[PDB]
Amino acid sequence: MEAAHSKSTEECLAYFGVSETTGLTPDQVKRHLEKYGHNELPAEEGKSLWELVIEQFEDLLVRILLLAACISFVLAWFEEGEETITAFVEPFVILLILIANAIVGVWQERNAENAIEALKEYEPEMGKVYRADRKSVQRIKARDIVPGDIVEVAVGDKVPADIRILSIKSTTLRVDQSILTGESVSVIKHTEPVPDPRAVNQDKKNMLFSGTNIAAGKALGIVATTGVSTEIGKIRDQMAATEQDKTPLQQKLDEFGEQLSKVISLICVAVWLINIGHFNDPVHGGSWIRGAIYYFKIAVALAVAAIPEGLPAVITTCLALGTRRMAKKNAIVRSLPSVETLGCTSVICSDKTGTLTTNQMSVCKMFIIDKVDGDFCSLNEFSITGSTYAPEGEVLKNDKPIRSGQFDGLVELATICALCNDSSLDFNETKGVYEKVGEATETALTTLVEKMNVFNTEVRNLSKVERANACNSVIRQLMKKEFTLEFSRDRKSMSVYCSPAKSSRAAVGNKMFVKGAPEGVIDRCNYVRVGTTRVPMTGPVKEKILSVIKEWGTGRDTLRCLALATRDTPPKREEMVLDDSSRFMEYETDLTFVGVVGMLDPPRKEVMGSIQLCRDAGIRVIMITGDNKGTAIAICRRIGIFGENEEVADRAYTGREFDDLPLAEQREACRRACCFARVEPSHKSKIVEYLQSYDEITAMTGDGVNDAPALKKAEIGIAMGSGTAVAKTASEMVLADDNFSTIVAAVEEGRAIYNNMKQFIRYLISSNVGEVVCIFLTAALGLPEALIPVQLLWVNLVTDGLPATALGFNPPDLDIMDRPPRSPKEPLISGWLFFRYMAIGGYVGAATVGAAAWWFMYAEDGPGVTYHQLTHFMQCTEDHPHFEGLDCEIFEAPEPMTMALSVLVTIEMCNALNSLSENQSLMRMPPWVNIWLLGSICLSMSLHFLILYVDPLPMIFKLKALDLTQWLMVLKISLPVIGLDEILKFIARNYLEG
C-alpha cells in the first residue's frame, strides 16, 4: 500500500480487509506473503578471498607473467633424476611473486563492508502482531511480517516495517528517526491523514519507518509496506543500482596494462622478423627442438624486462603511508585508493551547520516595539554579548548595559522564550563548561533568558550547576505549561498553552505563547504589544518589523530570527482537537506580536581561509543548507563563497526553486551553482549526478541513511566523526572533527600523494623501457643475453623498489595548491615526456649492452676478442674461426652478466635522483633534499654488494664480484645519463614553454 499516510485510518483497514480488533486471518498471511514476499532486505551477493585471488589472475599482464612461468618450465627439462641442485629458480621466483602480488591486491586492499550491508543492522529480528488465530500479541520474526497485519510498538522497540499508525494508546507517542536524519531529538506522531499524496518523510507524521525506535509511548498501527518497499528499503535499492566507477589512476593504469600486453607480443614477432634468415639455413645441423627452445628464453626475458613488478608493492606502500598521514590531519580515509582520487577533487558540497559552522548557536540581537502612532513605528532594540551557552554576558541598549526587566516588553520576550522552550542548559563538571540539552536553537533561547534575568533573581550566589537554569525556573513558577503544539515545517511555528499558578496578576484566562519563523508568525498577529498595552497591527508597523528582520538576516550579521507572539485570549481548553496537527495553525491565530530575537551559528574560524585556498586550488565549493535563501547567500559571502558585492542571481537556489526547473536547466544550474537553501536529501543525489554529467570529481558531505545514497554516488562521500553508523559506512572519508577545512587539507595531501606517484610510476617504467631495449639488442645483434630473468626480478622488486618508495616522500611544491585540479583525462606519459623516456630507455638499452659485451670485447682478464662475430655463432658446432683452444662455454660466464647488472643498478640510482622533480635541474633541485632517497640508494647498493660476496647468492644470480677496474667502467658508462637528463630538463623548461 503506497500512499498510506494520505488515507484515513479506516481507508487503510478497508484496503487490506482487516479488522483492527482481530487482525489478519492465517489465510491472508499466506496469500499475502505470496504477493509481497518477506519483510527482509535481499541477501548479500557474496564474496570470498579465493575467487578474489582468481579474479586478479584474469588480468592481461598477470596472464603474461604466468605464461612466462609456463615457458620458464618448458625450457629446462622433464621429470626426476639426481642433482644439479642450483637450477629451478626462474620459474619458482615468478610464481612466488605472483601469489605475493595477488595477495597484496586484497588483505591490504580492503574490499569488505558496504553501506548496503550495514542496512542489515537496523532491520530488526522480532516484531509484535495481532493475528486472528490467537487473541494475544504474538511476537514473530520481523522477516515474516507482511503488508496489512496489525502491529504493536512500545517504547524501546525498533519499528519492524513501514506502518500507518492506527491508534496511540499512550498519552503521546515519540519516535526516534535518527537513523534517517541524525538529529537526536525525537518526533511526535499522530493519526490524522497527511492528505498530500506526495509528502516528504518529514511531514508524514502518522507513519513509522522500519528501522526507527519508539522513544516514548506505545501504539498500534497497520503495516503499509515491508521488505524493499519501505523508506529505508528504497534507500537500500538506490545504492544497489549505483555503478561504482574505478579511480582516475586504476583507469589509466588499466589501459597501460593493455598497451604493455600489446607491445610484448609485438616485439616477440619483431624479433622473428629479424631471425627470418634462419629459413635459409641447412636442413641438417643446429638444434631443431633447440631452435624452438631459444626463442623462448628471449620471450621470457622480454616478459620480465617490461614489467615493473614492484609497482604494486610500491603503490600499496605509498597509499598506506598516506592514510596514516591524513589521519594526523583528522581525515579518516577508508577505501585505500580513495587517496589518489582525493587529489582530483573538483567540487565540494558541504553541509553548513557543524562543518562550515560550529553549531554553537547564540542570540545576540533582539527587539520589541517602542511606540506606534500612525506611521511612526519606532523599535526598541538591544544586543546580547557572549558566544557560549554560558549564562555569562550582558544585554545592552545603545551599546551600553541596561537592566533588562525595566522594559515591560523584554519581560514578555523572555517569558515566551522560557515557556515555549523544550530544551535546557546543563553545567558539565568534567570539561568545566555548559552543555546544551536538546535543540541548539532552543538552548540558545534558554541561555538568553538567563543573561536577560528579567526578574532580578539573585544569581551570583548560586553555583555553576544551579545557575545554569536559574531564571528559566523562576519563570516556570509564573506560568504552568498545560499542553504544547509541536513545530511543523507546515506552519513553521510552535506554541505552548499556559495557565497562571500562585498569587500573580494574569487572570481572566490563560495564554498561548507562539514562537516560530517570522512572516509565519507575523502574518498571524492582529495585535502588536507596545509595553504592557496592545494596539492593532498596521501596515507601517508590519513593514518596520519586516524591514529589520530582513536587515538582520540578510545583513553581514547573517542572523536567524524568531518571532515571538502570544494569543492573549486563547480558545477554550475543550475546543482544540489536540490530535489534529492540521488544526494547530488555526489555534495559533489572532496573535499579538511581542518581538523578535536573532541568533548566530558562527562559521568555523578555520573555514574562511580554507575557502580561499580552494579558490586558488581551482576547486568549487557548494554549501547546502537550511537557512532561507536570503540568509543562505549572506552566510556564503561571510565565508567568502561569494564576493562581498557580487552577482549571484542564478548561483543560489532553493529546494522548491530547483524542483521547478525542467531537467536541462537543473543540469545547467549545477555547474554555476554554489549554494542550495532548504533542500531535500533527495536533491543531494540529483546534484552529484549532474556534477558528473560534467566529469567533475565530487566530494559531498552528508549524514543519516537519508544521505547514504549520495555519499555512495559521490566519488568522495564524506561522513562526520559525530555522524551515524550507516552514514560512515557509506562514505570513503570521515572527518574525525567534523571540520570543513579537514576536507580541504585532505584534498591537498591527496594532491601531493598523486604528484609523487606520477613520479615513481614513470621511474619504475623508465627502467622497463631500458631493460627491454637491452634484450632487444642482445637478440637483434645475436650476442649472449646480457641480462637474465632472476637478475631483473631483483632489480624491479628490490633494486628500484626502495628508491621508488622513497620518492614518495618528496617535498611538495610551494604552489601545489595554486594550480587548477588535474583532469581525469590526463595521461601519465605524453608529449615531450614520451620522448624523454624513450631516450632514457634507449640509453639504458645501450649502456647495459655496451659495458657487458665490453667484457667480451675490450677487457683485460676476460676473453677480449674484438669483433669476434658474436653475432655469427653461439652454436660452436663448427669451432672453425677459433682454431687452437678448447673453451666455448665462456659465453655463459658470470663476469659479463655482472657488467650489465652493475650498469643498470647504478644508472637506476642516478635516474632516481633525476626523478626528485620533473623540470627542476639537479642544480636547482639538489639531490640531498629527499634525505630518504639518498638513504634508499645507500641501501640499494649495499644489496648489489651483498648478492656478490655472500657466496650462495652470486652463485644463484649467476654472478661474480667485479674488479676495481670493472667498477670504474660502470661509472664511466653509467653517470653520463644524469647529463642526458639535464639537457632535456632545461629544454622543456625553455623552448617548450608558453
Ligand X SMILES: Nc1ncnc2c1ncn2[C@@H]1O[C@H](COP(=O)(O)OP(=O)(O)O)[C@@H](O)[C@H]1O
Ligand Y SMILES: CC(=O)C1=C(O)N2[C@H](C1=O)[C@H]1c3c[nH]c4cccc(c34)C[C@H]1C2(C)C
Residues that bind ligand X (CB under 6 A): 351-353, 489, 625-626, 655, 678, 680
Helix axes 740-780, 607-616, angle to 10 degrees: 30
Q: Is 375 annotated as a binding residue?
A: no
- Of 449, 428, 426, 450, the closest CA to residue 437 belongs to 426
Decide which of Mg ion, ligand X, ligand Y, none touches 530; Cβ closer than 5 to 8 Å per partner kind.
none
Q: Is 960 annotated as a binding residue?
A: no
Q: Assess 935 for contact with ligand Y (CB under 6 A).
A: no
Q: Which of 15, 25, 37, 56 binds ligand Y (CB under 6 A)?
A: 56
Nearest residue to ligand X, scored by beta-carbon proximity = 626
Q: b/e for 629-667, b at 16 or more Cβ within 10 A?
A: bbbbbbbbbbbbbbeeeeeeeebbbbbeebeeeeeeebb
> Of the two residues 39 and 625, which places its CB atom closer to ligand X in the complex?
625
Instruction: Look up cell 534575568; give the residue.
Output: 453
- Smallest distance, ligand X to C-beta of residue 759, A: 41
Nearest residue to ligand Y, scored by beta-carbon proximity = 101
Q: Assess 304 for contact with ligand Y (CB under 6 A).
A: no
Cell output for 436: 546544551
- Measure CA 878 to chain center: 70
> Of the two residues 67 and 268, which places its CB atom closer to ligand Y in the complex?
67
Decide which of ligand Y, Mg ion, ligand X, none touches 588; Cβ closer than 5 to 8 Å per partner kind.
none
> Of the two residues 487 and 794, which places its CB atom closer to ligand X in the complex?
487
Q: Is 304 annotated as a binding residue?
A: yes
Decide which of ligand Y, Mg ion, ligand X, none touches 352; Cβ closer than 5 to 8 Å per partner kind.
ligand X
Contact 606, 744 (CB under 8 A): no
- Smallest distance, ligand X to C-beta of residue 691, A: 19
> Of the two residues 58 and 80, which places its CB atom closer to ligand Y in the complex?
58
Decide which of ligand Y, Mg ion, ligand X, none touches 903; Cβ closer than 5 to 8 Å per partner kind.
none
> Of the two residues 633 and 757, which places its CB atom closer to ligand Y in the complex?
757
> Of the two residues 65 and 369, which places its CB atom closer to ligand Y in the complex?
65
- Smallest distance, ligand Y to C-beta of residue 316, A: 11
User: How many Cα atoms are found within 13 Å in the side-chain-facing hemisphere of 876?
Assistant: 12
Q: Which of 24, 65, 522, 769 binds ligand Y (CB under 6 A)?
A: 65
Residues 6 or more apart in contact with residue 185 via CB below 8 angstroms: 438, 439
Q: Is 796 annotated as a binding residue?
A: yes
Q: Is 182 annotated as a binding residue?
A: no
CA distance 910 to 980: 11
Helix axes 539-554, 629-638, angle to 10 degrees: 40
Q: Assess 800 for contact with ligand Y (CB under 6 A).
A: no
> Of the two residues 68 and 639, which places its CB atom closer to ligand X in the complex?
639
x/- site string to ligand Y, residues 306 to 345, per CB under 6 A?
-xxx-xx---------------------------------
User: How many Cα atoms are found within 13 Å in the side-chain-facing hemisphere of 679?
Assistant: 26
Return the residues of window 294-353 that contact Mg ion according to CB under 5 A: 351
Q: Helices in 342-439 by DSSP H: which ranges?
A: 408-419
How is 631-699 classified by DSSP, letter by letter?
Answer: HHHHHHHHTTSS-SS---TTTEEEHHHHHTS-HHHHHHHHHH--EEES--HHHHHHHHHHHHTTT--EE
Contact 194, 206 (CB under 8 A): yes
Q: b/e for 953-977, b at 16 or more Cβ within 10 A?
A: ebeebbbebbeeebeebbeebbeeb
> Of the two residues 56 and 202, which places its CB atom closer to ligand Y in the complex?
56
Q: Is 963 annotated as a binding residue?
A: no
Q: Which of 256, 434, 593, 837 binds ligand Y (CB under 6 A)?
A: 256
- Smallest distance, ligand X to C-beta of residue 360, A: 13
x/- site string to Mg ion, residues 347 to 386, per CB under 5 A?
----x-----------------------------------
Residues 6 or more apart in contact with residue 114 via CB below 8 angstroms: 239, 729
Q: Is 290 annotated as a binding residue?
A: no
Decide which of ligand Y, ligand X, Mg ion, none touches 65; Cβ closer than 5 to 8 Å per partner kind.
ligand Y
Q: Is 590 annotated as a binding residue?
A: no
Residue span binding ligand Y (CB under 6 A) among the ranges 276-284, 304-312, 418-426, 602-610:
304-312
How is 884-914 classified by DSSP, letter by letter?
Answer: S----GGGG-HHHHHHHHHHHHHHHHHHHHT
Q: Is 878 annotated as a binding residue?
A: no
CA distance 259 to 511: 80
Q: Which of 18, 62, 475, 632 binds ligand Y (CB under 6 A)?
A: 62
- Return the DSSP state at 809: G
Residue 362, beta-bridge partner list: 600
- Smallest distance, ligand X to C-beta of residue 678, A: 4
- Smallest distance, ligand Y to C-beta of residue 59, A: 5
Active site residues: 351
> Of the two residues 125 and 245, which places its CB atom closer to ligand Y in the complex?
245
Neighbours of 34 (CB within 10 A): 9
- Smallest distance, Mg ion to C-beta of residue 402, A: 37
- Smallest distance, ligand X to C-beta of residue 655, A: 5
User: How many Cα atoms are found within 13 Å in the side-chain-facing hemisphere of 404?
Assistant: 26
β-strand 620-625 against 347-351: which pairing, if any?
Answer: parallel
Amino acid of residue 241: A
- Smallest distance, ligand Y to C-beta of residue 337, A: 13
Q: Is 625 annotated as a binding residue?
A: yes
Q: Is 560 annotated as a binding residue?
A: yes
- Of 924, 912, 926, 907, the closest CA to residue 975 belongs to 907
3-state secondary structure 180-223: CCCCCCCEECCCCCCCCCCCCHHHCCCEECCCCEEEECEEEEEE
> Of the two residues 655 and 976, which places its CB atom closer to ligand X in the complex?
655
Q: Assess 253 for contact with ligand Y (CB under 6 A).
A: yes
Cell output for 262: 600489446
Decide which of ligand X, ligand Y, Mg ion, none touches 730; Cβ closer than 5 to 8 Å per partner kind.
none
Residue 377, beta-bridge partner list: 372
Q: Is 523 annotated as a binding residue?
A: no
- Of 116, 117, 112, the closest CA to residue 336 belongs to 112
Q: Is 174 annotated as a binding residue?
A: no
- Smallest distance, ligand Y to C-beta of residue 309, A: 4
Which residues sit at the interface with ligand Y, rule CB under 6 A?
56-57, 59, 61-62, 65, 98, 101-102, 105, 253, 256-257, 307-309, 311-312
Annotated binding residues: 304-305, 307, 309, 351, 353, 442, 489, 515, 560, 625-627, 678, 684, 703, 706, 768, 771, 796, 799-800, 908
Positions touching Mg ion (CB under 5 A) are: 351
Residue numbers in the known binding site for Ca(2+) are 304-305, 307, 309, 768, 771, 796, 799-800, 908
